[PDB]
Amino acid sequence: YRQLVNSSFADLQKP
Amino acid sequence: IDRSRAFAKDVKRIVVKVGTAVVTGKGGRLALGRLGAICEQLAELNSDGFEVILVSSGAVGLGRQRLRYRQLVNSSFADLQKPQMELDGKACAGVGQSSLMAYYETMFDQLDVTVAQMLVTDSSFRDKDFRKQLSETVKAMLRMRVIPVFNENDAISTRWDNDSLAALLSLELKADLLILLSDVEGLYTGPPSDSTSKLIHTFIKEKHQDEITFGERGGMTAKVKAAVNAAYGGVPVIITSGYAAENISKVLRGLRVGTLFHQDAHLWAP
Amino acid sequence: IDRSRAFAKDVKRIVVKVGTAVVTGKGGRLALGRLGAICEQLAELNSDGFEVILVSSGAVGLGRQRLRYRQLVNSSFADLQKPQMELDGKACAGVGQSSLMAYYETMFDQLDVTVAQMLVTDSSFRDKDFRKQLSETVKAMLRMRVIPVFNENDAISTRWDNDSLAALLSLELKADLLILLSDVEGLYTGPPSDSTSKLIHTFIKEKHQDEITFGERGGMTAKVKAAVNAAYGGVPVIITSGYAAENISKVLRGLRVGTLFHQDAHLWAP
Amino acid sequence: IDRSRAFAKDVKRIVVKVGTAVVTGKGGRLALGRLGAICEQLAELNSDGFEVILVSSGAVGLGRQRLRYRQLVNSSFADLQKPQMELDGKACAGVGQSSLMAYYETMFDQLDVTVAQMLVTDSSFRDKDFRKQLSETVKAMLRMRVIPVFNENDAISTRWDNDSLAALLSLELKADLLILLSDVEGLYTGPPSDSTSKLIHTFIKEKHQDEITFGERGGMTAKVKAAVNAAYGGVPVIITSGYAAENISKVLRGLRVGTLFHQDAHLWAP
Amino acid sequence: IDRSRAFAKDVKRIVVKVGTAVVTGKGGRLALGRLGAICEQLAELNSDGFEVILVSSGAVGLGRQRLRYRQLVNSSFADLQKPQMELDGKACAGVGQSSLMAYYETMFDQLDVTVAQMLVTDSSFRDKDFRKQLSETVKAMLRMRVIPVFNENDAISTRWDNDSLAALLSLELKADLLILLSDVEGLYTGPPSDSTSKLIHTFIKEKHQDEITFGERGGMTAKVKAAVNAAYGGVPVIITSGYAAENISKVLRGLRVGTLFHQDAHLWAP
Amino acid sequence: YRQLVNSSFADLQKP
Amino acid sequence: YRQLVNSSFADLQKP
Amino acid sequence: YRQLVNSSFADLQKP
Ligand SMILES: Nc1ncnc2c1ncn2[C@@H]1O[C@H](COP(=O)(O)OP(=O)(O)O)[C@@H](O)[C@H]1O
Ligand SMILES: Nc1ncnc2c1ncn2[C@@H]1O[C@H](COP(=O)(O)OP(=O)(O)O)[C@@H](O)[C@H]1O
Ligand SMILES: Nc1ncnc2c1ncn2[C@@H]1O[C@H](COP(=O)(O)OP(=O)(O)O)[C@@H](O)[C@H]1O
Ligand SMILES: Nc1ncnc2c1ncn2[C@@H]1O[C@H](COP(=O)(O)OP(=O)(O)O)[C@@H](O)[C@H]1O
Ligand SMILES: N[C@H](CCC(=O)OP(=O)(O)O)C(=O)O
Ligand SMILES: N[C@H](CCC(=O)OP(=O)(O)O)C(=O)O
Ligand SMILES: N[C@H](CCC(=O)OP(=O)(O)O)C(=O)O
Ligand SMILES: N[C@H](CCC(=O)OP(=O)(O)O)C(=O)O
Ligand SMILES: [Mg+2]
Ligand SMILES: [Mg+2]
Ligand SMILES: [Mg+2]
Ligand SMILES: [Mg+2]
């Protein structure tokens, strides 16, 4: 969850 | 047809300006239908032997929409809690100009019309050679059946709205008509909201200048200034709503619509 | 990896220039494949944390193609016997800039990249305020992950090629690398045609300047001048063929390809 | 709000059909403004939580325009004296479908909406498995916030208009509303030209079927047939002019506009 | 020029197939440069008096990319922790076909070429009338200097790859050459990875069929099957890498590149 | 024929 | 924060 | 002139 809360939306797009 | 619009029978070169309230719609996105109908009307005019010149606007807003999207795409959820910084205006215009030009080119290709982009700054107009060369280039482009689309280069400026730029080009190019497409049906003696303000049909500098009570880029005060400038200079000025594209054809058909600015209206005063 | 290209490990902001021999192909039409591969490489670089700046060219040629088509469409058969007059150059650039910008915007949208158009004239660079404000705007756009695409506004000029403009922007913006994409594999001691000319890998101002024998906008003499300017100024310069898009990644990977212009090459002299 | 349109408060899945008299304008070219306003309205509806399905048309006409242009471009002046042969219809549809799909995709990308193209022939509807699988696929696409755009594959047919296809899909997909965008304000008891024909607001199969006197793909007889089919089946049907895009929002707001086909109108008979 | 490719001097109607490994590049996005060079080559061939037919592919992948983007745009952060469901394939193809067709139309308009979209399912080929009518329509389109672009309608199928569809169309249309653009330089006696596999130049059904050891839509086994089918049928088959667009011109120039499938190779056996 | 020899290609496009 | 953690990216785009 | 009267518009486009 920490990683997600510190990701940029674009990052979520890339595996 | 009233003689107040008798000049509509011999108008050959016209200048059309579209404000940001016309090109951009909800949420800062492009008003597809409105802007598309305007382009259809312009292509129809160009086919019938008219040489038109379009001064558009809407670069800043589109730019802002796109840049905000990019910011949100790149942001990190932990950053959507704190408030975001307010975007750079010149970058916004730089993006919006490219987007608007691509969109215009797409639908003018769809209508089988060739268009050219001319971005001019205020500082460039201080040279006589620049004005002469611009007149030559625009004359050549108009002779080649191409619609010039001007604007102010905001991305590179070091700072006079498009309305004033429109008047300038119409006077420098000796155009026969200047049309200002706004979001309102025309000039009003007061705010359009109240019922105590009526629709003008002919502007009289001596009379009509005092009783107008404007509200608190440039709003309508600027528009009026630019129009009066163009008129005095020699080019009639017409203000009409850009929400209905058929307003252009009706204006060119002599139909009495919109607000007019003619120096000869002193004699044509009813 | 030779130490002559050791700077490729810390290059962050780069400037890429594409000549007209790269953007335009047969018949003055757009080189779709070449230009598309270049854009793919640029988008890949932008994703990996680089801030790139593209100075393109090809406006004049595309414009000419389109305007010639329009002339032929409007001509009357009785006019195809007599010879046609030669098109206006500034109108040509005005049309070509819009077409090129729309095309660039289309495929950068396809690659999910936001781009902005900045057209700057020579006369605008005589103000210190202009340079400061341009640096601020470009810094903001690069921080917002947007690729600026510059060029010279030919449509409005009153006349320094893009090569010189590239060098200027790279020195004013303190970029870490300047890449000149040409149609040849790189600088040569003579004409590329003969077999007596070999491929340089490092340019030495003291040595290599005399024996070069160039042929009879700006060709390669101008390119060399601009490169040496940028180098002396502080920004390394790389010249490589734009026909293979993977040349960009190879250059950024430290691979020894193309011609280099570094002031430190005096110490790095082999 | 009259209770005759009380169903407009719970309509969730709707089907919108645009006729060739709406998509195509003068000279067989695309009606940019009209079609753009329709797309803007559809995107606005899609944002507000509606799942819409568009069945369009205009492939044949656009195709014909483009193919005629190509024929004229390739013709030899000595061939413009003799009369040209009349173009193949299926080739015309094949070109027009691609052009229309590209144009739709362009402006739905502009409005930030994803669209999908589904071309279905009459012969494919004779399999139960096909209908089940189509329902599953369309349900998935609607759940994914994507607007399906159907049509008949004319390019490959071996031959039921879009109106009938619309009714079919609306009944197979259990849509809550079927809107038929035509060029007229709605159904009429006679030809719209004369002043002896008045505007219907609710269609009664028992009563209103006899006194209607239609003139001499499918015109309005077909439209009425398809509408009555959809109604009987269970899906209300609304016929309204496609010239004003705000008609869609007004219909979805419960405003009494257009012609309605409800089986419950027997009880709602005034 | 070896006599094994002597047929290249009289080939007039050709069929070109592009696999998904050619049209789609990194991340499921469109391979702009590769696909653009292919289109440039096809337009050049079309200008020189050839009638080409393109069977493309890449709908499913593009569709998937776009739909994934839409899912991520609509998702709620609380949903990015749990694993997302796997997308519907037919919806994916439905979106991808539209996107690919729009992209193809854009750059074929850029190259001044008219294209048409033909989507055909397997179930439609069970009627003799369908084949006759398809041959007539394709003949008319080819005579009108238009490039047909076929594919399988996946969005509506109830399920034979494009390779097999290519062979089918090439045999039904009596084309003079069938080119299969793959990601590899051609057929190999084994996997391309190891150094023990060499490049074939002519395929012999009697000899070469046994020693080939393929690995574990359709891969290369299917490709070979389809090629042998087309050959036996009468239409030579050429397999070559689609990464270099000049391979097409080299093949049409008689240069010995790629893998060939000719029934006459029994006599032309070296 | 005179009309044709004095038409502009665009004109041929319009009836 | 709860609202954000329960918003869809698109929602963040609209004020 | 004969050549012109027997050319296709496209041909005129190419030198
Ligand atoms: N006296 C007036 N008559 C008409 N409109 C006025 C008046 N005073 C203010 N306005 C307002 O000015 C607006 C148009 O100015 P502006 O917004 O600058 O045009 P645009 O931005 O579209 O170029 C109108 O929407 C109108 O409400
Ligand atoms: N000494 C040299 N070494 C390499 N190329 C040279 C030399 N002298 C002249 N050239 C020519 O200059 C050309 C590149 O200059 P230019 O045409 O101005 O680039 P572009 O127009 O693509 O920006 C090359 O095609 C090359 O043949
Ligand atoms: N009784 C009627 N009421 C209304 N319209 C009618 C009637 N009879 C014929 N029409 C004509 O039918 C036309 C609409 O049918 P059609 O052309 O098939 O729609 P589209 O082609 O736009 O799908 C209208 O333009 C209208 O003039
Ligand atoms: N004997 C073989 N010779 C060549 N390629 C082979 C062989 N066996 C398997 N392949 C593989 O098959 C692939 C091409 O098949 P395929 O992926 O179906 O093409 P596409 O998907 O591009 O249409 C090549 O990448 C190649 O590595
Ligand atoms: N740069 C231009 C400025 C135009 C302008 O300020 O005038 P207006 O938007 O009031 O017509 C733009 O915003 O698009
Ligand atoms: N106006 C620009 C000039 C660019 C220029 O002259 O430099 P080059 O075309 O040699 O790279 C154009 O032609 O596109
Ligand atoms: N192939 C479709 C047929 C559609 C059709 O015939 O119905 P209509 O054009 O009357 O709405 C087209 O013409 O675009
Ligand atoms: N629907 C088509 C299927 C094509 C296909 O499976 O063949 P291949 O992708 O192996 O060339 C697509 O995926 O684009
Ligand atoms: Mg203003
Ligand atoms: Mg040069
Ligand atoms: Mg009908
Ligand atoms: Mg396969």
In three state form, how does the secondary structure of D22-35 look?
A: HHECHHHCECHHHH
Q: Coil, helix or strand for C229?
A: helix
Strands (E), chain E: 13-18, 51-55, 114-120, 146-152, 177-182, 237-241, 259-261
As given in the structure block, the two tokens for residue H7 are: 């050319």
Contacts with F2 from chain D: Cβ below 8 Å = none
Residue tagged 């936001």 (tokens)? C114
Element (H, E) at E65: helix E59-74
Q: Where do breaks (C to N over 2.5 Å) occur in chain H, by preceding residue number?
A: none
First-to-last alpha carbon distance for chain F, in angstroms, is: 15
Alpha-carbon distance of B31 to D110, in angstroms, equals 10
How many D×H Cβ pairs under 8 Å? 18
Cβ proximity of E10 and E176 under 8 Å: yes
Alpha-carbon distance of D153 to D120, in angstroms, equals 6
Cβ proximity of E93 and E61 under 8 Å: no
> Which residues neighbour B18 within 8 Å (Cβ) at sequence distance 6 or greater?
B35, B38, B54, B55, B56, B57, B58, B181, B242
Closest by Cα among E190, E188, E214, E213 to E201: E188
Please spell the DSSP secondary structure of D175-211, one letter per residue.
Answer: -SEEEEEESSSS-BSS-SSSTT--B-SS--TTTHHHH
For ligand 4, say whether the CB of E214 is within 6 Å of any of its atoms: yes
Cβ proximity of E153 and E184 under 8 Å: no
Q: How far is the CA of E134 from the centre of ligand 8 (A)?
A: 21
The residue ranges of every structural domain in chain E are 3-266
Alpha-carbon distance of B189 to B186, in angstroms, equals 10
State the CB neighbour count (10 A cutoff) for residue B19: 21
Nearest CA to ligand 8 atom 11: E19
As given in the structure block, the two tokens for residue D106 are: 């362009």
As given in the structure block, the two tokens for residue C90 are: 């500034």
Positive or negative: CA dihedral D131, D137, D143, D146 = negative
Q: Which CATH number fits domain B3-266: 3.40.50.620, 3.90.180.10, 1.10.645.10, 3.40.1160.10?
A: 3.40.1160.10
The radius of gyration of chain H's CA atoms, rounded to the nearest angstrom, is 7
Note whether B36 contacts D: Cβ–Cβ < 8 A. Answer: yes
Chain C nearest-CA distance from F15, in A, is: 16
**Does the beta-carbon distance from C245 to E33 stay under 8 Å?**
yes
Q: Please tell me which of the candidates B94, B114, B116 has its beta carbon nearest to residue C141.
A: B94
**Does the beta-carbon distance from B72 to G12 stay under 8 Å?**
yes
Closest by Cα among B262, G14, D157 to E118: D157
> Which residues neighbour E138 within 8 Å (Cβ) at sequence distance 6 or greater?
E53, E118, E148, E173
For ligand 5, say whether the CB of B247 is within 6 Å of any of its atoms: no
Alpha-carbon distance of E242 to C114, in angstroms, equals 29
As given in the structure block, the two tokens for residue E225 are: 């099957």
**Phi, psi for C55 (deg, rounded to 5):** -110, 110
Pocket test for ligand 1, best of B182, B189, B240 (most atoms within 8 A of CB): B182
SS percent in chain A: helix, strand, coil, step 5: 60, 5, 35
> Which residues neighbour D41 within 8 Å (Cβ) at sequence distance 6 or greater?
D245, D246, D248, D249
SS percent in chain C: helix, strand, coil, step 5: 50, 15, 35
Q: Coil, helix or strand for C117?
A: strand
State the CB neighbour count (10 A cutoff) for residue D216: 3
As given in the structure block, the two tokens for residue E205 are: 């059904």
Q: Please tell me which of the candidates G5, G6, G9 has its beta carbon nearest to residue E73.
A: G9
Q: Coil, helix or strand for H7?
A: coil
Q: Quick one: DSSP state of residue D83? A: P
For ligand 4, say whether the CB of E87 is within 6 Å of any of its atoms: no
B155: left (phi over 0), alpha (psi -120 to 50) or beta: alpha
Element (H, E) at C150: strand C146-152
As given in the structure block, the two tokens for residue B201 are: 């049909």
Q: For residue E87, give Cα distances in angstroms to A14, D49, E90.
A: 17, 21, 9
CA angle E16, C42, E249 (to 5 degrees): 25
Question: Tell me, what amino acid is at E44?
Answer: E
Cβ proximity of D58 and D100 under 8 Å: yes
> Which residues neighbour C253 within 8 Å (Cβ) at sequence distance 6 or greater?
C8
State the CB neighbour count (10 A cutoff) for residue D231: 21
Alpha-carbon distance of C33 to C26, in angstroms, equals 12
As given in the structure block, the two tokens for residue D98 are: 């691609």
Q: Tell me whether residue D112 is annotated as binding.
A: no
CB-based touch C/G (3+ pairs, under 8 A): no
Q: How far is the CA of E202 from the centre of ligand 2 (A)?
A: 42
Longest dimension (CA), chain C: 69
Please spell the DSSP secondary structure of C238-260, one letter per residue.
Answer: EEEESS-THHHHHHHTT---SEE
CA dihedral B185, B186, B189, B191 (to 10 degrees): 50
Alpha-carbon distance of E121 to E133, in angstroms, equals 15
**Does the beta-carbon distance from B106 to C101 stay under 8 Å?**
no
Q: What per-residue string of b and e applies to E16-34 under the rule 16 or more CB within 10 Å gives b? A: bbbbbbbbbbeebbbbbbb
Alpha-carbon distance of D169 to C244, in angstroms, equals 50
Q: Please tell me which of the candidates H1, H4, H13 has its beta carbon nearest to residue C72.
A: H13
How many D×E Cβ pairs under 8 Å? 139
Residues of B (47-106) whose Cβ lies below 8 Å from C: 63, 66-67, 70-71, 74, 87-88, 90-91, 94-95, 97-99, 101-102, 104-106
Q: How far is the CA of C222 from the centre of ligand 2 (A)?
A: 9
Positive or negative: CA dihedral C221, C224, C226, C228 = negative
Question: Tell me, what amino acid is at B223?
Answer: K
**Does the beta-carbon distance from F4 to D72 stay under 8 Å?**
no
Alpha-carbon distance of E104 to E116, in angstroms, equals 10
Alpha-carbon distance of D212 to D223, in angstroms, equals 14
Q: For residue D175, give Cα distances in angstroms to D232, D258, E115, E260.
A: 13, 19, 35, 53
As given in the structure block, the two tokens for residue C26 are: 């047969």
**Does the beta-carbon distance from D156 to E124 stay under 8 Å?**
yes
Strands (E), D35-183: 51-55, 114-120, 146-152, 177-182
Q: How far is the CA of D186 from the centre of ligand 3 (A)?
A: 9
Please, which contacts does A3-11 make with residues 24 or more away whose CB atoms are closer than 8 Å?
A4/B77, A4/E77, A4/E80, A4/E81, A5/B77, A5/B78, A6/B76, A6/B77, A6/B78, A7/B76, A7/B77, A8/B73, A8/B74, A8/B75, A8/B76, A9/B72, A9/B73, A9/B74, A9/B75, A9/E72, A9/G9, A10/B73, A10/B74
Q: How far is the CA of D191 from the centre of ligand 11 (A)?
A: 15
Question: Tell me, what amino acid is at B169?
Answer: L
